[PDB]
Swiss-Prot record:
Annotated segments matching region Interaction with spike glycoprotein E2: 51-56, 143-147
Active site, per annotation: 35, 57, 109
Residues of the full protein shown: 107 to 264 of 1245
Taxonomic lineage of the native organism: Viruses, Riboviria, Orthornavirae, Kitrinoviricota, Alsuviricetes
Region (Dimerization of the capsid protein): 79-89, 115-119
Written domain comment of the UniProt record: The very N-terminus also plays a role in the particle assembly process. The N-terminus also contains a nuclear localization signal and a supra nuclear export signal (supraNES), which is an unusually strong NES that mediates host CRM1 binding in the absence of RanGTP and thus can bind CRM1, not only in the nucleus, but also in the cytoplasm. The C-terminus functions as a protease during translation to cleave itself from the translating structural polyprotein.
Residues at the site labelled Involved in dimerization of the capsid protein: 83, 116
UniProt effect for mutating residue 57 to N: No loss of autocatalytic cleavage by capsid protein. Infectious virus is produced
Subunit structure: Homomultimer. Interacts with host karyopherin KPNA4; this interaction allows the nuclear import of the viral capsid protein. Interacts with spike glycoprotein E2. Interacts with host IRAK1; the interaction leads to inhibition of IRAK1-dependent signaling.
Effect annotated for changing residue 41 to H/Y: No loss of autocatalytic cleavage by capsid protein. No infectious virus is produced
Annotated organism of origin: Sindbis virus (SINV)
Name under which the protein is recorded: Capsid protein
Amino acid sequence: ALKLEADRLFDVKNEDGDVIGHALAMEGKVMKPLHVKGTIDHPVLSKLKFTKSSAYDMEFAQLPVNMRSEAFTYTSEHPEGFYNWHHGAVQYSGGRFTIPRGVGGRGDSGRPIMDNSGRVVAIVLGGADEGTRTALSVVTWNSKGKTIKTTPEGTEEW
């Protein structure tokens, strides 16, 4: 098994170039957290017209007809249990996505949370530490395609 995958996740860098977040190709759009102020490290995508959505901390542009195939697929069905992401397992329980305390932070915004079949279940924006864990502030859509934004008490944007 070699992890040969398309180009879907892109870096968003700051003025000096630090990676402060992530942008993703999904369901025909390039999307990144609105609070993430930087540029998308991509010669084509950094030149697109991004539409803003303050209510959900989302910014998005339409994917170039070409790239539209190199993208993630969303899913609105998330039974409880364990999910995958860049740093490991993500536990979904009580309608909340949690990761161990001291794992998430700056740079992790824009990152997706996947299921085993490789579908996106959510997009990380920030987290609120609660005891031994951290409750994530994510964006998720429902079965009727409606965007929903869950933000725990005292969530710090990553």
